[PDB]
Amino acid sequence: QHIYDIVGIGVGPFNLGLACLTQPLNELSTIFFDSKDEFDWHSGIMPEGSTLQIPFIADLVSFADPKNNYSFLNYLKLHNRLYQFFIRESFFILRAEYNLYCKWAAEQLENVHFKSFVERIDYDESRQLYTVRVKQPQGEMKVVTKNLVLGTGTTPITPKFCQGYPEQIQSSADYLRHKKDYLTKKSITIVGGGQSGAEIYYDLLSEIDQHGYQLNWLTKAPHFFSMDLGKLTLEYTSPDYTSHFYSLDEDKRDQVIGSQNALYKGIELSFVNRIYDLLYQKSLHQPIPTRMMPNCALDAVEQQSNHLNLTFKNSDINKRFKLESEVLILALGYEYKIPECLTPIRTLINWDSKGRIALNWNYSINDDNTIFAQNIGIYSHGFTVPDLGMGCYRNAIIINTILGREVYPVEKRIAYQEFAPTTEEIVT
Amino acid sequence: SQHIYDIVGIGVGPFNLGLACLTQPLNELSTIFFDSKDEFDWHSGIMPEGSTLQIPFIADLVSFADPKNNYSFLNYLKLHNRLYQFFIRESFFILRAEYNLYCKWAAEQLENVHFKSFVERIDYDESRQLYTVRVKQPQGEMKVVTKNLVLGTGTTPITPKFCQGYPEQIQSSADYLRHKKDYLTKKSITIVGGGQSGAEIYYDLLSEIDQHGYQLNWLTKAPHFFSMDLGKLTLEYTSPDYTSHFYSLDEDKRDQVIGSQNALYKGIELSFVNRIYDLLYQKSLHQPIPTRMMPNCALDAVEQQSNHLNLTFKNSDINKRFKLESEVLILALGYEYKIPECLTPIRTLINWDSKGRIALNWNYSINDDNTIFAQNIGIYSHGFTVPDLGMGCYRNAIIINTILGREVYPVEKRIAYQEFAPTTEEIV
Amino acid sequence: QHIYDIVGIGVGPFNLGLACLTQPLNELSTIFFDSKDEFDWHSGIMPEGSTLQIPFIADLVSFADPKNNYSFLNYLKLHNRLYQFFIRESFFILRAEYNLYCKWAAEQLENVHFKSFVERIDYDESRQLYTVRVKQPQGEMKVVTKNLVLGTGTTPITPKFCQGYPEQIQSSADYLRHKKDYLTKKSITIVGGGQSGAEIYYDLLSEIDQHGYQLNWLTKAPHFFSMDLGKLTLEYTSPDYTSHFYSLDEDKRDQVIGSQNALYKGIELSFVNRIYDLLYQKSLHQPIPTRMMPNCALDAVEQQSNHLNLTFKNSDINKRFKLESEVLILALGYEYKIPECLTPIRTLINWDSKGRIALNWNYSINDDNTIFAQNIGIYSHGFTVPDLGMGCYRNAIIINTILGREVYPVEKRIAYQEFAPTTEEIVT
Amino acid sequence: SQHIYDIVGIGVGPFNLGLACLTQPLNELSTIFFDSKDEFDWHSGIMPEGSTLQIPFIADLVSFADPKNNYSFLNYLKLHNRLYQFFIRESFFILRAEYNLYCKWAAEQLENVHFKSFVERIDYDESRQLYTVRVKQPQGEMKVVTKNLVLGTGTTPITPKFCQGYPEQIQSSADYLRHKKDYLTKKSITIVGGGQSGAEIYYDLLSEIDQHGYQLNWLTKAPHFFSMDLGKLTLEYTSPDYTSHFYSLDEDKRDQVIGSQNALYKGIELSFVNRIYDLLYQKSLHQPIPTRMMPNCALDAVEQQSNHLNLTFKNSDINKRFKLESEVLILALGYEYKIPECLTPIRTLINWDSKGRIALNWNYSINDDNTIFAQNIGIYSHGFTVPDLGMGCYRNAIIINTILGREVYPVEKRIAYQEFAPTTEEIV
């Protein structure tokens, strides 16, 4: 019977930020649902000492309002860790601490409900009402709302040729769940040279002398490339660039986004460099039983005895080769999967030439501007669509759109670079 | 006229400015703050381009007490369109010039913070238990009445008596920038004092030594141009833990301890030490640099000559005196607390220690009433972080809590992994 | 009448290194010629403080033989800079010191002749000897030799449409000759986003407050990207990778080189970050009169009243635009131009399908293996062909080839990575 | 047997090893070296994986004297296929395990460097002007005669008197790796000493604390866990300039000066201090770490209890003593010079100062004939760099020049920008 203004579907950092930023707005009735038991930010792939790769300003609220109660600094103040964090004097939060922080913020918000799987959404055009059915442990529930905000995140990619070997092939995302088993194996092969694979490789490399596994690491990319966090390149993480990229033609958007892996993927440079320093240190007396191979794409898997035969394609020599491995860790990246709850309103969503969800500038995905998208469409808003540092930018625009006024005024120019000439400098 | 303030702040440096920022939210308290300068100014005469604070930006006016407060540096950054850029810059250290803009911004918002206001005299009325504070402003003298004083008159450059009276030739490092243009035309410049002040002037003048004709001399009495020890295990001394520990030691041990801690808060920022050497290396490539640097050298006498000063130095290593000629002498000998003249009529109401110094209670009051509180007084009583901008919020919280008689701003008790004393039970 | 074993054409760092490495080998008779007045390593684009981008081990000899008299370390020892260089504790030599280093070495070798322009080479098919004709101020030298080593380096790129404007368009290579005029202009435009452009941008941005120029910097690259010097990418600077790249198909070689701009071009990361910090600092009080545009390619210059009209294509928006500018600095990179002296023996040199000089693995470019190439064939030996870190490698192979002996034995594997599988794992 | 040596080196740590490397190309000198250990070993018992030297690699056996020398670390790297790898690693600090292999490799080249050779006794024959050196070897007792002696017997762990006689429970930091496996099974470990040895054991044990059940206690009597000051202006004290300055001072001043300089060559390396804090921060995220760190605490009593030690410390801040229980105690109290027993028969030929210490001449000889030289003796005589590996070549050059009577390895007189004394003409 109560009509919500917003239902958030999924509570990752982005919708959690939205809860924190709408909490102070008494005008808005909001509710949020997440299927997990409690907040968890990728803790299956979270070795001790792992950090976010961007500064702590990219918390749930501070880019929109440093005064908000759920800033990371206030969390630190309230948990007797503020002085300690600044003695540590790193801009990068420990991923475990970031988990504790978001858990704390999620726990303060009564309208944020975990153990809540959104299974179905329907729309009543006469009342402009979405009905959201949620499976909760005590049973199914119904809420109605004017606006939806989708924040269902992304999930590991598993190629179809890699399915059906649950005992031997696992995703990087579940690494800590299996590391104990991994340490007893004769051979471990990581596929994918991004940050996930790099952290797993460093973690296994650190312990390689205490066990008897061979440690292989392969990526199809032309090298184990570093993420380019050069500051002039960081200006692309900006309202400036977001707005510029969204204005671009659709094919141009795909080309540009295709060239930008080094802006937000790859390996953190200092981490790259720690891997090398560890290789140097452990090869002092005898060679390390480890192999690293760029330009190699896994394209086949077959069982044989009690190991896998992994077939790769070396793009440089254009040949295929086989390595044997007892376990295969896929660190192949994450992808957006459409939530099944959207199925009955699919005809309410706009789609582009290529059948992807089409976004408006303000992150709505329908003509009525009542369905908004968290972390959807790097092809539409650019490579910072998954960047925690642009989460406040997006939530502020969502909030401003829904309430129809500048609740959180958003910056328009923070970059010294210009990504286009003024309309008056163009030559006919 | 008949209005009675809870607090009068005398002086508005960062410490009393922070106190005004942290009390403004408290509508119980009626507070007012007076400063003699034309406007807020934080040592802008010794503020070369690119110069920074030596502690992280968390050490702003309010954030260690309350990260939600409206006058945090991050909120300043947000309201001035510098928040995204500050974090692309990704330094913990605020440009000294930006810290000046930030404080002037805070001061301008607080209508009870009055500059052009010299506090000439303080009297006490034992019948009413009220201080009357006489203030000289451009339009004349005014009187205000208050229950509590908070003394925030800061520190001033040390100019020994033998260096006074040579205005054209001897200047304080505090006024470097007003005299830099004249300096560049001289044939010899001698900087005395090897702290951060002297170092920045040395680097600045060395940086342009090739475009002029000055010999550049730099001498310190310290046993070497030592660096400030900001080792994180030493930073735990910047903490409630250590302030409380130090305060509890006896007076003579406190003088011993503080006399041993020059490296914890004075000396030169390490990376700045290193930039100086690198510049020496770079500029000595083709020919010697006309510069001299001499440790273990104390300025001993100053004799006027024809067109220069004869500077006598005592070298303590060889226990001999020597003379240098210099056209101008830049005094970078450090800063000292001078008891303001307004306090004279109430001196017999203030507590003094066994060495004739103002004595402070744990809560920073200097009388039995606990109605007069001291900002940046008593390095010998609360330790070397008494002038530390990072402990300003801790002191302000305790003052505010004392005056209101409750924990408005609750204060940390242990933040250090180290213990500075065993437990009662472990003592033999 | 005397028959040399080696004539070196051009004495840049690579042939200078070959002189230093063949000098201890009395079985070789060698001579080198260079047209400049003395050794000069790009001193026209060498702002004070600028450094090499690779560690000092990439000197003239040390990768082949650290004992050699012409190591950088020995240079520093003999010049009372060894202790100082290691207090400075940077791996990167100042460019001005590297110049002094190479000048020092070139001056010790009497068989290294400057003011010597190699004008013509002919080949005696019967005696298997080359006749080299050298123009010198006092006349012409004719020497006979069994082998040639070409080390004529590379030169700045000037597009045809930028030619014919000697007053208003200059190369970045001549920056320091023109800086004084530049500082007087109303507008300065730098085209090219590599290290050359960046250092000029930084150098002019540093002084922008003292003059009245607008400072524009544009590149056609998708961003002002950083050079990827991650240690796992540095492993591509190796015999391992050089041999691997050399073996690849011709078109694969061009594809790979096309994708590797970040391995050896773009901007030094520490240097990109200093640029941003300077922009941050200098915009504190007012906006900087500077513009930076990626994705912009200069494609026309037109003369006007007292300035140039510069038309650019912005590839993101697929439109062209015009800026006005009094001076235009070309920082578009360097290119190999084949020396005129080779014209008579062109028929001796091997060419590939694109009409480029075709190199054998041992860096010879003819079937006799008597003409060797320094810094030719990025399309054949890969992106490290101009890498000072690989000069001793190539020189050892050139020396070993000419003598038919392992005089300087060369490493076959220094990398943890493998760029190809073992022969036995290949799948048919 | 009757062969008359020019030099007998007693002890072969790095300093006499470098002397062997520097004298080996001088055929005028007949030298022999004896060391009592089974082979060269540089503190391998306190050599955790990844531990490094704290000064740059230029401070190898020979390179400050002669970068061309065959025994340079760079030459070592090249011949062991680690030169390229070392410079990709791009750290100035050699892993202590690698430096160990380097010194082992150098010692293996020198047929005149004999291990398993304890110099038992030294006599002097006035009639022959020869020292007889009696050496205990596995085979028997070897005698050799020699004109000069160079004492290089190093330093040994400090063990207070009240800490002797508890072999199963108290061990030196020097033997940490012999006992680490036992340590990990204990309930309580206590490290006394806050220097680099203490820090490395502390960090090593802290890293593994979660997988075990020890409480980990660390205490130093220093007023904080101070960092070693390696500011480059302080690095200039590691120089011939300062050694000559320090040597020239009077004896009491030398003791005073050396007393003030702990931060210059002791303490903890700054980056290591900061890693310890970062690890403490990381491992306290969920539960408090079972560890204690106490400065200002001097161990002054050990007391056997049943299953553990009662450790009594004096907290000098509060001037009280307290007891901690500990199953094991690790002494990281530093190292001392002990006079070798073999010098006893020639004690009356050695010069002694007014305090009973070995008195050194400027050229490092300790007798009037200038035929007995001292490695790593006389910190009170030649200053804090007497044990500094970066000054080994300087001392060795001066020893070799003295014995040969000419400037064989010329020695720098001034490397420092600073002056530690005025010119004679300036003195009053």
Ligand SMILES: Cc1cc2nc3c(=O)[nH]c(=O)nc-3n(C[C@H](O)[C@H](O)[C@H](O)COP(=O)(O)OP(=O)(O)OC[C@H]3O[C@@H](n4cnc5c(N)ncnc54)[C@H](O)[C@@H]3O)c2cc1C
């Ligand atoms: C290991 C890792 C580290 C990363 N580190 C960084 C970083 O340092 N900086 C940065 O800018 N980016 C980083 N990213 C990228 C990005 O920030 C993360 O992917 C982030 O978790 C995405 O945020 P979110 O709110 O979109 O989705 P998520 O954090 O994925 O959360 C979405 C949640 O919605 C829930 N959900 C899905 N469907 C339903 C449903 N039908 N009903 C109810 N709930 C549902 C799921 O439980 C899911 O957990 C990282 C990504 C990974 C994988």
Ligand SMILES: Cc1cc2nc3c(=O)[nH]c(=O)nc-3n(C[C@H](O)[C@H](O)[C@H](O)COP(=O)(O)OP(=O)(O)OC[C@H]3O[C@@H](n4cnc5c(N)ncnc54)[C@H](O)[C@@H]3O)c2cc1C
């Ligand atoms: C150049 C410099 C840089 C420093 N940098 C740092 C740093 O990076 N980190 C750190 O922790 N510490 C730093 N310090 C130390 C310390 O923080 C400063 O000295 C700081 O300014 C002290 O603040 P304050 O409120 O005590 O006094 P101040 O900032 O000195 O302010 C005192 C004010 O009181 C006014 N006043 C005095 N008497 C009267 C009166 N009778 N009536 C009215 N007004 C009066 C004066 O006009 C003055 O403006 C620095 C000090 C200096 C000099």
Ligand SMILES: Cc1cc2nc3c(=O)[nH]c(=O)nc-3n(C[C@H](O)[C@H](O)[C@H](O)COP(=O)(O)OP(=O)(O)OC[C@H]3O[C@@H](n4cnc5c(N)ncnc54)[C@H](O)[C@@H]3O)c2cc1C
């Ligand atoms: C500004 C700049 C900085 C660079 N920095 C680095 C770096 O830090 N690290 C790195 O690995 N690479 C660097 N490079 C790339 C490369 O190392 C340089 O281009 C290097 O100068 C090339 O060396 P060289 O021996 O090929 O040719 P050069 O240094 O170009 O020298 C060739 C010489 O041959 C002479 N010559 C030409 N023709 C004749 C003739 N017919 N007769 C006689 N003499 C002739 C010329 O006078 C010329 O000086 C840099 C390049 C530039 C332009």
Ligand SMILES: Cc1cc2nc3c(=O)[nH]c(=O)nc-3n(C[C@H](O)[C@H](O)[C@H](O)COP(=O)(O)OP(=O)(O)OC[C@H]3O[C@@H](n4cnc5c(N)ncnc54)[C@H](O)[C@@H]3O)c2cc1C
């Ligand atoms: C753990 C540790 C790390 C250090 N790291 C550094 C550093 O990074 N940088 C730096 O500048 N300094 C460092 N030092 C200080 C100094 O360099 C070392 O103490 C160094 O080992 C001293 O060198 P040495 O040649 O004097 O003596 P040692 O290395 O002690 O060698 C002494 C040798 O003499 C032998 N010997 C003794 N008596 C006899 C005898 N009667 N007959 C035969 N042989 C005998 C011993 O067996 C021993 O091998 C370190 C010290 C320690 C303890």
Ligand SMILES: NC(=O)c1ccc[n+]([C@@H]2O[C@H](COP(=O)([O-])OP(=O)(O)OC[C@H]3O[C@@H](n4cnc5c(N)ncnc54)[C@H](OP(=O)(O)O)[C@@H]3O)[C@@H](O)[C@H]2O)c1
């Ligand atoms: N030791 C040092 O610090 C130092 C100093 C200077 C140079 N170097 C080295 O010397 C080499 C050359 O450096 P460089 O900066 O002179 O050349 P560069 O690295 O090739 O940079 C030139 C840039 O200008 C772009 N460009 C070319 N034509 C253009 C056009 N019409 N319009 C707009 N942009 C255009 C290029 O685009 P593309 O990316 O598409 O080619 C490229 O990005 C580099 O490897 C460099 O590292 C080193």
Ligand SMILES: NC(=O)c1ccc[n+]([C@@H]2O[C@H](COP(=O)([O-])OP(=O)(O)OC[C@H]3O[C@@H](n4cnc5c(N)ncnc54)[C@H](OP(=O)(O)O)[C@@H]3O)[C@@H](O)[C@H]2O)c1
């Ligand atoms: N390359 C490396 O990484 C490395 C590793 C180990 C050692 N070293 C070098 O070797 C030298 C010795 O280092 P070290 O750490 O073994 O010893 P150290 O530097 O001399 O420090 C030992 C510490 O224990 C303190 N101490 C002495 N007696 C004590 C007592 N009864 N109770 C409590 N504390 C006591 C000492 O206090 P005081 O300060 O009052 O004397 C000192 O701080 C140093 O120069 C070091 O730099 C280098």
